[PDB]
Amino acid sequence: GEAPNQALLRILKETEFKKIKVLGSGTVYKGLWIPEGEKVKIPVAIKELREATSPKANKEILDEAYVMASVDNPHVCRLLGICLTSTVQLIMQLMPFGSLLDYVREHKDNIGSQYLLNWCVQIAKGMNYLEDRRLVHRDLAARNVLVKTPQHVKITDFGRAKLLGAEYHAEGGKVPIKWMALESILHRIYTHQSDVWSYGVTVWELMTFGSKPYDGIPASEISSILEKGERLPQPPICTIDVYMIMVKCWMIDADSRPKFRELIIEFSKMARDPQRYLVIQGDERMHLEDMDDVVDADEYLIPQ
């Protein structure tokens, strides 16, 4: 037998929170949560299913809720609770600067080496934590990392996350070919080491300020390109030191890839001397009613 999952799933009354405005279209809202009987306001993102007249859609969102409730790490998104109105609502920590994909696209000109490499560290810590929790994300991508502040990012989108057991077996869907390990595209094998392949791609997105991997290459062709030994090119800002780490994440032998713990170490060494490891034009010259009882979710802790 495995260790029991004693995560608490918190049920919230719809009256505990206020939708302030729409971020995306079901529909994600920016809002505020007052925990019942506590003098605190918590900035939240409220993910509300549209119809939910789909029994299928409901399993998907509750699986997400299951996983986000069972994770507690500074570099992974946690659930504050769920609301069981007509439409099931996930309440989570608001990540006000949006996805790191949009953030690096929008801010190409203001992002220096210190921020890129620290991001690579934080995503490695997030991902190592999940590995410690025997969790395979299966959808790591710069779009699925959110920005709390420019100094603080979190892995999100646990919709595809599964427990390990090594090779996890899948059986269809709309899948992110350009981020996936070869063994995942060919045999639907997913491991922590398939997650290291997508970490690799995620880092290439950051280091290219959000370029599209294999842009203008049909997904049908990716498996053959990879089998032919082709990989994404060295980004302009990347020293061979940084690119060689990306390349090792894209080895065909899964056990020849680095471990998330090793990636933490290698990126931290690089983060102590960022301008040795990334070369960016103008790097040194770069900067990035009642709110009284507002507390960030990260300072809002309930008994464990």
Ligand X SMILES: */C=C\C(=O)Nc1ccccn1
Stretch in the footprint of Cl ion (CB under 5 A) among 61-69, 73-81, 122-130, 279-287: 61-69
Interface pick for Cl ion out of 268, 274, 286, 300 (rule CB under 5 A): 268
Binding mask 37-56 for ligand X (x = CB under 6 A): --------x-----------
Cβ proximity to ligand X: between 8 and 186 the closer is 8
- What residues numbered 88-107 form the site for ligand X, per CB under 6 A? 92-95
Instruction: Provide the minimum distance between the beta carbon of 300 and Cl ion in the complex, in angstroms, as a whole number.
Output: 9
The answer to whether 271 contacts Cl ion (rule: CB under 5 A) is yes
- Residue 92 class from Cβ within 10 Å (0-12 exposed, 13-18 middle, 19+ buried)? buried
Q: How far is the CB of 157 from ligand X (least distance, A)?
A: 8
By CB under 5 A, residue 278 contacts Cl ion: no
Q: How far apart are CA 117 and CA 169, in angstroms?
A: 33
- At position 115, the amino acid (one-letter code) is Y
What's the closest the beta carbon of residue 161 comes to Cl ion, in angstroms? 6
Residue 139 known to be catalytic = yes
**How far apart are the C-alpha atoms of 260 and 63, rounded to whole Å?**
24
CB 199 within 8 A of CB 140: yes
Catalytically annotated residue among 72, 139, 290, 298: 139
**Angle, in degrees to the nearest 10, between helices 260-271 and 192-207:** 30
Please tell me the distance from the alpha carbon of residue 80 to that of residue 11, in angstroms, as a whole number.
9
**Position 201 contacts ligand X (CB under 6 A):** no
Burial status of residue 81 (CB atoms within 10 A of its CB: 0-12, 13-18, 19 or more): buried
Structure-derived torsion over alpha carbons of residues 116, 119, 120, 121, reported in degrees to the nearest 10: 130
* Distance of closest approach, residue 150 Cβ to ligand X, in angstroms: 15
125 neighbors 75 (Cβ within 8 angstroms): yes
State in angstroms the smallest separation of the CB of 207 from ligand X.
Answer: 23
Exactly one of 46, 91, 146, 237 binds ligand X (CB under 6 A); that residue is 146
Distance, CA of 280 to CA of 193 (rounded, Å): 30
Catalytic residues: 139
Residues at the site binding Cl ion, with contacts judged by CB under 5 A: 63, 121, 268, 271, 302
Query: Which parts of this chain interact with ligand X (CB under 6 A)?
Result: 23, 28, 45, 77, 92-95, 146, 154, 156
